[PDB]
Design a protein around this ligand. Sequence first.
Ligand SMILES: [Ca+2]
Ligand SMILES: [Zn+2]
Length: 207
Amino acid sequence: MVKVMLLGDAITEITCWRPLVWEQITSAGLAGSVDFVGSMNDLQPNCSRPQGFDPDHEGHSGWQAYDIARNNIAGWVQNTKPDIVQFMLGTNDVNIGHRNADSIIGSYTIMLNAMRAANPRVKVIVDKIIPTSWSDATIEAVNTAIPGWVQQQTTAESPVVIADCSRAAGFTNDMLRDDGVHPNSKGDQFIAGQIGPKLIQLIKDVS
Ligand SMILES: [Ca+2]
Ligand SMILES: [Zn+2]
């Protein structure tokens, strides 16, 4: 069994891209080979929940990378020992914390270090962050920084790869809810199509 932690904020907790990814996993022939792990298991009722879906995740609405890095991720990975960790974090660091991109990249490094302390062979997907409807420049600066962060951090033993969910990759404002931060169903389809093929490759790598 490959254990996968889907770490994040509301963009992971309240959305429907995780069931769409489960359907991609199921089609690939992997449904009985993957365990989604995490302390959460809620799924919104609007989502289409596929047969055999694993609702486990590590997404927490409103939570910041800053906090998760320093206070939570070590306990979360100790408890579940994932093989793969996929994340999108930083939206709330900007919109709630009023933190800068340097802070968010630093939090990424703290998080990756904790992941690796628990599992030196962890494979990681960092997501470029979806835009806001106002095209928040701090989110975009994180996105600009992510490739250099990956190039500095990745190793053959613990590969880090990008799932690019950004504006540059095609995330449009018509993929956002009225609040301007959360994806709607179109956004969720876009996100799933960016994460899922990256995740499936890594699953097969562990196998
Ligand atoms: Ca599970
Ligand atoms: Zn569960």
